[PDB]
Amino acid sequence: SFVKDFKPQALGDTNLFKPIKIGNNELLHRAVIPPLTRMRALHPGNIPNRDWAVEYYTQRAQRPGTMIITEGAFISPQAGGYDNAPGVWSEEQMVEWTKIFNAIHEKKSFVWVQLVVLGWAAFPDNLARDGLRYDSASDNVFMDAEQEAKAKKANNPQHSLTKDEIKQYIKEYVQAAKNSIAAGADGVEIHSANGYLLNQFLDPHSNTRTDEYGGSIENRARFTLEVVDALVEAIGHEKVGLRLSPYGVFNSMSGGAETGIVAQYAYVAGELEKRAKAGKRLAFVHLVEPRVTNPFLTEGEGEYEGGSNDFVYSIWKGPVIRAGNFALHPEVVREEVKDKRTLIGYGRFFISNPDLVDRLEKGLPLNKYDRDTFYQMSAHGYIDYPTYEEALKLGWDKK
Amino acid sequence: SFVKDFKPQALGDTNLFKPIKIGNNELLHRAVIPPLTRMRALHPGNIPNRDWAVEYYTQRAQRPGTMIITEGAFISPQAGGYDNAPGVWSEEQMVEWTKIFNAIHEKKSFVWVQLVVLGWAAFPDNLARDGLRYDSASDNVFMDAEQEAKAKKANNPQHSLTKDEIKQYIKEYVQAAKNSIAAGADGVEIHSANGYLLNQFLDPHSNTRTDEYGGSIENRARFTLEVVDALVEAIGHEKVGLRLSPYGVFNSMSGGAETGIVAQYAYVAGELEKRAKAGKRLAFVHLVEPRVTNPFLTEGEGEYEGGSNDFVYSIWKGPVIRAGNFALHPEVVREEVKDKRTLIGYGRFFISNPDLVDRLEKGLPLNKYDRDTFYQMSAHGYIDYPTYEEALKLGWDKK
C-alpha cells in the first residue's frame, strides 16, 4: 500500500533535480541511496546474494545518473560478525560484486562501496566460532549488558585494539578499497558513523584509551583520519567519501548529551578541509541528521532537537550528503537543497520504492515499507516492491 | 547628522523588547552595550576619566533596564600597555568606577566590567618604560613587524609566559573581579576575544607552545577555562560571562582561514555547557559575529561569509549576546532575536546614539558616528552626541 497520510510534493523544481559531480561521477540528480544493510548475503563466506542482489540494485539504479552507496561491506573476516552481511575481501565475494556493479552501470547509475568494521556491534559468538576477536576501542565499556555477557560466555571478552591491530585493520581497509575499485566500483565510503568501530574511537563514551588513539579530540579522531589518508593514497581522494553521525545514539554512542560532541566532529571536518586545501579533497562527506538518532525507530521518533549539522558547512567546503527522515518531509528537503552542494540520502523509502527518484520529481505517493523484511533472507520485501505504475495496476490508489 | 541612506525599522514588536534575566539582572530589553574602548582614562595610573566618564555612562544607561558592558579594563599594570585605557587594580581607579556604577544604577540599568589582558597587542615601549614585560603565548610569532621591532628597540622582546606567570595573571583576574564587584558592578566579562592575550592562547597561529598550554585544542583553551573557573569560584557563575570572536582576524588572529577554528571554539562552548550542567552556568556567552572580523573597518567591510556562529547554539544552552554590524541591519536583528535566548550588542552606534534603545524600538534615524573621536582625549565625540530630540532641535532632520 501507499503511505496513507502523506501529502507528496513535486521536487522537480528544486536543486534536487540539478546535476552535480561527485568524485568522477556526473550525477543527474541529488537523491542518493545511502548504505542499507539488508542481510541477504549467504553463509558461509559473507557472499552477496547470488539470486537477488543484482536485481535489487538494478531496480534501484533505474533512474539514470543515480548515486548508490552499497549496503555496508566488511573489509575482512575480523571486521565482520554478521553472517548475512557481505564482505569485499574474497574472490568469491568480488565475483558477485562485479555483477552488481556492471548492472548498476548498465542503468547509467553509479556505485560506491561502504567499507565497514563492526567493533562492539558484532556478535561475539559468531566471531568466537570463527576464531576471531571481539574488538573495540576499549575493554572496560560495553555496548550493552547482553553483548558483554555474550562475549564472556563465548570466551571472547571485548578486546581493546593494540596499535598493531589498528594498523592491520588499516591494511584491510586499503585492500578492500582496491578490491572494490578493481571490481568496477566508482568509489568507496568509509563508515565512521552509527556506532561501528571507527565511531567507537571517535566517541568519548566508548573510547577510554590513554594512548595516542584516545583521551583527546585529536587522538579520538586519529584512526578515522588514518583510514582516510590510507585510502586517499591507495585509490585517490576523488574515490573516497566519509560517513559521520554526530548526534547518533545507535550502538550506544553519546549524541548531544556529550557536550564535546560538536567539537569532536568539527575537528574531523576541519582536518578534511585542511587536506582539501592541500590538494586532496574527498569526494563527499555524508552526514546522518539529528532527525534520526536511531534508524530502527519509526520516522519522527528519536529526533534530537538540540543540535544541527549545519556547523559542518562552515568548515568543510565540499559536497555534503544528508540523510534522515527526508522522504516524508519534502518541505524540509526543499529548504535544504537551496544550498548548492547538498545532496539528500533517502534510506527506508528507497527500500520500498525502487522508482523513488521519479516519485520525488513528480510528487507521487510513496509505497509503505515493511520493517519486518528489512533484514530477512527473502526476495519478499527486497525485490518485490512495485514501481508506481505497478502499484497502480495492483489497485494501490484504491487500498 | 543622521546616517543618510539608512531606512530604519521599528523593532518594538520583536523579542529585542522582551525582558530577560542575565545573571542577577532583570533586563527590560535585549539591546546590550558591548565593551567599547574610548581612551579617555588619564595617565598616570590608568584612571577612568574624572571629568566625563560618569556622564558618558549615565547617558548610555538612560533606557531603564539596559545591560552595559564597560570599556575593556586592565586587571594589572602588566596586563596593560595603553596609557589611556582604564584599570581595575588600584584604589584611585575604583573610586572613579564606583561613581560610574552608581550612576548607571541610578538610571535603573546594569553594568558588567570587561576584564582585559593585552598580550601582544600592548605597546612594548610603554611597558618597558614602566619596567614591565611584553607578553604573549609564544616568543617566535609576532602580531606584526612594527610591534616586533618596537619590542626589540625597547629592549623588551616578546616573552612567552611561564606557567607561574600564567598563574599570576589568574590571581590578578581574580582580584580584579573582586574589586569590580566590591565597587558595585553587577558582574564581569572575561575578554577572550579580538586577539588579546587569552585569544592569543586559543589561536594556533599565535600559540606555538609545546607545554600544556598549547599544541592541541584542549591545551590552547586551558588558560581561558582556568580564568573562567577561578572567577566562578571567586564571585559566582551568575556574575561571570565570556567573550569570544571565532572568526575574528583583528590583532592577527586566524579566523576562518584556520580550518580548525570552529572546533577550537566548539570545544570551549562544550566545556562551558559541561560546567553549566554540573551546576555552574555562566551568565552569558558574548560572540563577535563574522559580520565584523575587524571592528576598525567600516560596516560591510571585513565580513566573512564562510562561517556562522550558529554552531555555538547547538552546544551552549544559555544566553548568547551577538555583536557586529547590527545597527544598520534591523532586518537581520528581526530574524536573530526570534531565538528567545539571543541578545544583540550594538557598539559603534551606541557611541553615537546615547538613546539608541528608544531609536531601535521606534524605528528612528541614527546619528552618524565620528570615527576620528573614537579614541581621543575629549568630551567631543564622547558626551556631546545628541539624543533624537536634541538632534531634531539641531535641525538634523534637515541636514
Ligand SMILES: Cc1cc2nc3c(=O)[nH]c(=O)nc-3n(C[C@H](O)[C@H](O)[C@H](O)COP(=O)(O)O)c2cc1C
Ligand atoms: C534496514 C537499515 C539498514 C541500514 N544499514 C546501514 C548501513 O549498512 N550503513 C550505514 O551507514 N547506515 C545504514 N543504515 C542507516 C541509513 O543509511 C540511514 O542513515 C537511516 O536509515 C536514516 O535515513 P532514512 O530516514 O531515509 O531511512 C541503515 C538503516 C536501515 C533502516
Ligand SMILES: Cc1cc2nc3c(=O)[nH]c(=O)nc-3n(C[C@H](O)[C@H](O)[C@H](O)COP(=O)(O)O)c2cc1C
Ligand atoms: C572604538 C571601539 C572600541 C572597542 N573596544 C572594545 C573593547 O574594549 N573590548 C571588546 O571586547 N571589544 C571592543 N570593541 C569591539 C566592539 O565591542 C564590537 O564587537 C564591534 O565594534 C562590532 O560591533 P558594532 O558593529 O556594533 O560596532 C571595540 C570597537 C570599537 C569600534
Ligand SMILES: C=C(C)c1ccc(C)c(O)c1
Ligand atoms: C550491519 C551494518 C553494516 C549496518 C547496519 C545498520 C546500520 C545503521 C549501520 O550503520 C550498519
Ligand SMILES: C=C(C)c1ccc(C)c(O)c1
Ligand atoms: C584596548 C582595548 C581594551 C580594546 C580595544 C579594541 C578592541 C576591539 C578590543 O577587543 C579591546
Ligand SMILES: [Cl-]
Ligand atoms: Cl548473524
Ligand SMILES: [Cl-]
Ligand atoms: Cl598609549
Ligand SMILES: [Mg+2]
Ligand atoms: Mg581483557
Ligand SMILES: [Mg+2]
Ligand atoms: Mg509480513
Ligand SMILES: [Mg+2]
Ligand atoms: Mg626570548
Ligand SMILES: [Mg+2]
Ligand atoms: Mg572632526
Ligand code: NA
Ligand atoms: Na506538488
Ligand code: NA
Ligand atoms: Na528466486
Ligand code: NA
Ligand atoms: Na551555514
Ligand code: NA
Ligand atoms: Na537484527
Ligand code: NA
Ligand atoms: Na518600522
Ligand code: NA
Ligand atoms: Na569638561
